[PDB]
Amino acid sequence: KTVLDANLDPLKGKTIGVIGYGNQGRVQATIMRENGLNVIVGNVKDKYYELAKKEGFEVYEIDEAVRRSDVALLLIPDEVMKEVYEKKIAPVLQGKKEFVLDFASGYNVAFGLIRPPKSVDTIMVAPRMVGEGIMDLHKQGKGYPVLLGVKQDASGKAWDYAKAIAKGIGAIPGGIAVISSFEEEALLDLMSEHTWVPILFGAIKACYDIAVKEYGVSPEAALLEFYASGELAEIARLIAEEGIFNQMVHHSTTSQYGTLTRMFKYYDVVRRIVENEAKYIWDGSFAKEWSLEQQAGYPVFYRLWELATQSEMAKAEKELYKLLGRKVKN
Amino acid sequence: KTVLDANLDPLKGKTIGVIGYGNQGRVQATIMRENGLNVIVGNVKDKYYELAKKEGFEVYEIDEAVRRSDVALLLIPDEVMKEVYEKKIAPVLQGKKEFVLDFASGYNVAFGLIRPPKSVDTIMVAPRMVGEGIMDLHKQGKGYPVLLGVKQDASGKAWDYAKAIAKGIGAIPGGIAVISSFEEEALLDLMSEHTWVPILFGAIKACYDIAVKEYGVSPEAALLEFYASGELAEIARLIAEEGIFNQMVHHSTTSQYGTLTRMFKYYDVVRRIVENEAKYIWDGSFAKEWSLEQQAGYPVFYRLWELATQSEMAKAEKELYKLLGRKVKND
Amino acid sequence: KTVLDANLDPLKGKTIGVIGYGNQGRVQATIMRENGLNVIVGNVKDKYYELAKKEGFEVYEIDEAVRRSDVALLLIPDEVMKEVYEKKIAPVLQGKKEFVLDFASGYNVAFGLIRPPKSVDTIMVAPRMVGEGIMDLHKQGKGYPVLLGVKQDASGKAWDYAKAIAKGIGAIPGGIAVISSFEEEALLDLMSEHTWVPILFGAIKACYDIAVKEYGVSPEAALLEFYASGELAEIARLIAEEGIFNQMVHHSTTSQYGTLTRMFKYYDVVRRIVENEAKYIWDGSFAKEWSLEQQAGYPVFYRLWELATQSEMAKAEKELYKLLGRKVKN
Amino acid sequence: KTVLDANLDPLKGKTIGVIGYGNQGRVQATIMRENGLNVIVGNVKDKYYELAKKEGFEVYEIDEAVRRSDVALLLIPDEVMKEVYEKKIAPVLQGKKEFVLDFASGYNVAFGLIRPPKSVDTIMVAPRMVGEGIMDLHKQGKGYPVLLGVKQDASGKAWDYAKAIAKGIGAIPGGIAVISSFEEEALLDLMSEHTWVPILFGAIKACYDIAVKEYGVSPEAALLEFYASGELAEIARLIAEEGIFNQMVHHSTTSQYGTLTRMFKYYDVVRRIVENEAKYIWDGSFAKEWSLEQQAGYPVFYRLWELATQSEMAKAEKELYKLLGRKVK
Ligand SMILES: NC(=O)C1=CN([C@@H]2O[C@H](COP(=O)(O)OP(=O)(O)OC[C@H]3O[C@@H](n4cnc5c(N)ncnc54)[C@H](O)[C@@H]3O)[C@@H](O)[C@H]2O)C=CC1
Ligand SMILES: NC(=O)C1=CN([C@@H]2O[C@H](COP(=O)(O)OP(=O)(O)OC[C@H]3O[C@@H](n4cnc5c(N)ncnc54)[C@H](O)[C@@H]3O)[C@@H](O)[C@H]2O)C=CC1
Ligand SMILES: NC(=O)C1=CN([C@@H]2O[C@H](COP(=O)(O)OP(=O)(O)OC[C@H]3O[C@@H](n4cnc5c(N)ncnc54)[C@H](O)[C@@H]3O)[C@@H](O)[C@H]2O)C=CC1
Ligand SMILES: NC(=O)C1=CN([C@@H]2O[C@H](COP(=O)(O)OP(=O)(O)OC[C@H]3O[C@@H](n4cnc5c(N)ncnc54)[C@H](O)[C@@H]3O)[C@@H](O)[C@H]2O)C=CC1
Ligand SMILES: O=C(O)C1(C(=O)O)CC1
Ligand SMILES: O=C(O)C1(C(=O)O)CC1
Ligand SMILES: O=C(O)C1(C(=O)O)CC1
Ligand SMILES: O=C(O)C1(C(=O)O)CC1
Ligand SMILES: [Mg+2]
Ligand SMILES: [Mg+2]
Ligand SMILES: [Mg+2]
Ligand SMILES: [Mg+2]
Ligand SMILES: [Mg+2]
Ligand SMILES: [Mg+2]
Ligand SMILES: [Mg+2]
Ligand SMILES: [Mg+2]
Ligand SMILES: [Mg+2]
Ligand SMILES: [Mg+2]
Ligand SMILES: [Mg+2]
Ligand SMILES: [Mg+2]
Incomplete structure (x- = not known):
């Protein structure tokens, strides 16, 4: 029906290299680190690469991240993500054992514009706020609703990575998280x-x-x-x-x-x-x-x-x- | 009108370059050798190069292929010819005196996606089988029908090349060949x-x-x-x-x-x-x-x-x- | 559901009358005599009188046939079956304690052109093949699917005779048989x-x-x-x-x-x-x-x-x- | 393209056993006899029977007619012809090797209600009149038009029998006859x-x-x-x-x-x-x-x-x- 919380087991030992420091790139950053995770950040060396470094995230280039982490939260647009995925990440994807690939919204996945390996754990994590007011609720330790699901998996425990991030971004406990x-x-x-x-x-x-x-x-x-x-x-x-x-x-x-x-x-x-x-x-x-x-x-x-x-x-x-x-x- | 057979004159002395060795690869390939012609073959090094390697074809890349042959059997998809034709062949076409292009189907030609030189002869050679069952009918002698025609010619000696390749592919005699x-x-x-x-x-x-x-x-x-x-x-x-x-x-x-x-x-x-x-x-x-x-x-x-x-x-x-x-x- | 096999009890202790020896005649004829049952065959004298008993099946006329059997496999057309049913069989039908009446397809039954007695076991046994290739399916042992059902019963075991005849036709086992x-x-x-x-x-x-x-x-x-x-x-x-x-x-x-x-x-x-x-x-x-x-x-x-x-x-x-x-x- | 006349060869040495003596009964009957052909006639016994016999036709029963004749002009309705063709003529049809079968209109043939042997000559001979005035066109000699054709032949000369009857009925010469x-x-x-x-x-x-x-x-x-x-x-x-x-x-x-x-x-x-x-x-x-x-x-x-x-x-x-x-x- 609907999930309220889960064990926070897997991601202690695995690294998370986040991509993007936009609107959602600043809300997920603050939370997972403040709930028990070592993390690096990914963004191409423009104006944004200088700021989130001031958050202590030792930011490197994009491809420097996925070559280290088993995860990458692709908090970047739903339009230019195509351009990235075939210049940088796909040459990096095939050169990996395991990897857990997550997105915000699936305008590019559901419409077939991305077909990653079968060596990868595919998931979705969708916040349901504009991005600003979410920071009024996190300080309040208040959960908020998220949408989830899977497109493709080769692990058996693909969902706990999502349910982990479901507690990694603080959206729960307090709120709920939908299976979809x-x-x-x-x-x-x-x-x-x-x-x-x-x-x-x-x-x-x-x-x-x-x-x-x-x-x-x-x-x-x-x-x-x-x-x-x-x-x-x-x-x-x-x-x-x-x-x-x-x-x-x-x-x-x-x-x-x-x-x-x-x-x-x-x-x-x-x-x-x-x-x-x-x-x-x-x-x-x-x-x-x-x-x-x-x-x-x-x-x-x-x-x-x-x-x-x-x-x-x-x-x-x-x-x-x-x-x-x-x-x-x- | 519906033809049955023709002379097999021209291609004695001209090398049969071939591009692609897919499903129609093995169809036409071992017939031109079987009915008495020399061949070099074109493909791109992958799994299909393996089975292509096992059949005695002296294989080079594509650019070297058309630099030898006066003919070519572009037995490759109807979707990526556009990619090939403007990277490789067109720089080679203008650097060629005379040449005769053959195809399987004309989804790219008839809809104008290919504008070859005036120094080139153009033809079509279409089988009407899926590709597999030909060697059940071929060795049995009973052939199968084909379609033909022209788009552009600057020679006056054009149709015999098709009627030659028509015997190069073995679909004739026994079957027929339609003019179109x-x-x-x-x-x-x-x-x-x-x-x-x-x-x-x-x-x-x-x-x-x-x-x-x-x-x-x-x-x-x-x-x-x-x-x-x-x-x-x-x-x-x-x-x-x-x-x-x-x-x-x-x-x-x-x-x-x-x-x-x-x-x-x-x-x-x-x-x-x-x-x-x-x-x-x-x-x-x-x-x-x-x-x-x-x-x-x-x-x-x-x-x-x-x-x-x-x-x-x-x-x-x-x-x-x-x-x-x-x-x-x-799945 | 998709039934696969059954006990083969009922049809032992009788004689299997069969009407018609067209295409589906030799389909089912070959198998009942093969799988261990007694048979007499019914067809009206023409060229088919030659080839039918030429294969060993003894023959009497139709009125001489149905009187012997409790069963009957009306493997004749769906068009002229009306003509037969009211000249010959109906005067023979009423003169029976029990009887089992089976067809191939029900263009005449379902559309109401036949309303048999109260003490007849009505059933359907439909192959789903043209008829020729069945020996290419048969001698390999592989069954093939059949459709079944009931219209009117007064016996309690209207289905076992069908499931019995189902094994009498070779279409099972290996294949399936649908209830309908x-x-x-x-x-x-x-x-x-x-x-x-x-x-x-x-x-x-x-x-x-x-x-x-x-x-x-x-x-x-x-x-x-x-x-x-x-x-x-x-x-x-x-x-x-x-x-x-x-x-x-x-x-x-x-x-x-x-x-x-x-x-x-x-x-x-x-x-x-x-x-x-x-x-x-x-x-x-x-x-x-x-x-x-x-x-x-x-x-x-x-x-x-x-x-x-x-x-x-x-x-x-x-x-x-x-x-x-x-x-x-x- | 249209015909006007033919040779009158085939029907010499035969007998034309006509069926029916209705309105077109006296149309064709009077003319075949009066242009050099021997005839018997067929009609089932009612008032219509003896009046033909009153005019010289050596009449017998219908089925008597076909066994004396390689031809049969079925000048009878287009409705009850079905009833006849399966009670009487079909058991008689195989009696002949060659037999010729002519009709007036083909509401029963063209719509498939008749399928004779493949050893029978099938033809059409259609007068185009009511029937009364034909003996005004006849005595003056002025012909009148007819329609013809074939459905089935096993003889090679299915047409001269029609062109023969085309003079047997006197509709030509003087008029025409259409191929169809x-x-x-x-x-x-x-x-x-x-x-x-x-x-x-x-x-x-x-x-x-x-x-x-x-x-x-x-x-x-x-x-x-x-x-x-x-x-x-x-x-x-x-x-x-x-x-x-x-x-x-x-x-x-x-x-x-x-x-x-x-x-x-x-x-x-x-x-x-x-x-x-x-x-x-x-x-x-x-x-x-x-x-x-x-x-x-x-x-x-x-x-x-x-x-x-x-x-x-x-x-x-x-x-x-x-x-x-x-x-x-
Ligand atoms: N606050 C919001 O508007 C919300 C956004 N989302 C989701 O967030 C994702 C992106 O939105 P935001 O980044 O937060 O807002 P935004 O519109 O300001 O995105 C700007 C980001 O695009 C990145 N970017 C684009 N092309 C790049 C390239 N070639 N190389 C490096 N970086 C590139 C930039 O790093 C920059 O951070 C979308 O998938 C959307 O579904 C979902 C809920 C609300
Ligand atoms: N059953 C069929 O598919 C038949 C094929 N045709 C026609 O033949 C032509 C192609 O047919 P097939 O090759 O047999 O089907 P295919 O889909 O199996 O083609 C694969 C072959 O084409 C080559 N190839 C594929 N992609 C390539 C690429 N990017 N670059 C270089 N080479 C590539 C490869 O050597 C491979 O062997 C088409 O015009 C088709 O309409 C006509 C009759 C039947
Ligand atoms: N390929 C097929 O035709 C198949 C037949 N069936 C069913 O089998 C039944 C009949 O099929 P078939 O007999 O094999 O086709 P069919 O049309 O070739 O029938 C020929 C048989 O019908 C008998 N027959 C025909 N007219 C008769 C008459 N006036 N009086 C007595 N017997 C006559 C003859 O003995 C002859 O053996 C139908 O119910 C049909 O739905 C179902 C599966 C496929
Ligand atoms: N004015 C007209 O009606 C014309 C007649 N025809 C054709 O002539 C054929 C019949 O026409 P008619 O006989 O002249 O008209 P009709 O309606 O007067 O026919 C009655 C004649 O047919 C015979 N007859 C009727 N019922 C019979 C039955 N149950 N059994 C045996 N014999 C029966 C009788 O001998 C009787 O003399 C039709 O095929 C019609 O197409 C074509 C041109 C004009
Ligand atoms: O009651 C109404 O219609 C008002 C509205 O704003 O909807 C004016 C107060
Ligand atoms: O690819 C196609 O369109 C073909 C077909 O038979 O459908 C091979 C010609
Ligand atoms: O005669 C028919 O209608 C059948 C068909 O397969 O079309 C046998 C059942
Ligand atoms: O000229 C006319 O209008 C008349 C006719 O009969 O059509 C009355 C005489
Ligand atoms: Mg950018
Ligand atoms: Mg949207
Ligand atoms: Mg939205
Ligand atoms: Mg390729
Ligand atoms: Mg096509
Ligand atoms: Mg095709
Ligand atoms: Mg019969
Ligand atoms: Mg049907
Ligand atoms: Mg059917
Ligand atoms: Mg009458
Ligand atoms: Mg009318
Ligand atoms: Mg009229």
């Missing part, structure tokens, strides 16, 4: 980025556009109600803590009837959408969709940014942020 | 892979799925009728010698009427399909479809294999193969 | 004759027709690729032992992506075509659909044969068989 | 009975029904213009003689433009129809459609007759025929 597979992680992390999020923006991008152009509302008026307030975020504290559906008591009845009746009116209008995009991911199209834009130079990515920023809404909103006293993007 | 172009072969070799083959699988992947989940058949029951028996492959022999439509006498009348009526009921449902996929090939979309997923790292290819093997059908069929005593894969 | 009902047999044997087979022909009858009349291929060219070769041998024999899907390894990658992507494209296009036909069988229409044509002298059957043989394809393919030296229709 | 096969005959004879004829009736059954109920015309008024006059049948003679499209010259211009423009307006509305019915015949359904109705006792056939006769149109038309002084049914 790689497919069921990348599916969700992208489903948020396809179906429920962007529709939130379109409605806010349409209701405003529908108010001014058609129904005559002034631009400065509307945005104070839709999202320029903190209600759309201050609501989220209730959801994470007081629950989704009990949240509606804190708005009066006249908002409930208007909201619940429509939630079921326009339910089948969006389940039809989600059935398409998920099937557009289970097949791996979104990887072949993205992985060619990279091989063209981000044309569309450039344009749509050149529209939404230069759209009608941010125009009038930039005057608001110019008028509430906050910053103004160059 | 590059387009009309690569069109067909994929039309099988798009329209009539996969629909065969879907129906078998639906009728089973429709029997169990809706009509209550046990899974171990059905598969013994659909394809796991000697019903399907055993009748391919009747179609090969006794003819397609005369095959149906060997099933009684109650099976005939149910089949012929539906063959014409659901004909316009599939011609409707085939009109689309062929036009999706005549234009070259399928090459621009394949050419990119290569340049992404086989994402979709990985997934569908990760579905059909992990689907419902193979699961219960893997238990069957675990139960008839035959092999079952380590 | 009559409905689940005729459903499949006809579904192959309705959905996946004829579509195989139409595509081959369309792609060729579409190549020549629209895309300019010469007729002698195409057929050498589609089906005029024995390529279908070396693709489905792989399916017989090397598996449906693992056979794709023996075709290169470019033939896979073109095939698997389309198998899922045109899946829902054919599941419709199956659902409409199976429901046309579960209701019993196809038995009525045949049964009236039989009562009109095979008009349509005569015509479609006068089309498919006189079509464009055989008009050209016959000249190829006229040209490879293989047999032409004599 | 069985399929291309039954296709046409039924296509007339499916597409162009019944639509003629429906329009006449609708335009009237549309005039009275909707647009207010009286019933006695309209029918005098639509079909109760002999114009419509007199519109036909000009077609048979002066040709289809030159026929319209005898109607003034205001009727032409109203007719030609609509002939092309509502063309694809009926080609869309005909494509369905012919394919409903080429596959052989209409024989299976009919053949089962015979095996159910003509239920529908009874009803539609019980409707169209008891419809609104014949009701008011029967009063008109009751009013012009002609018959009343």
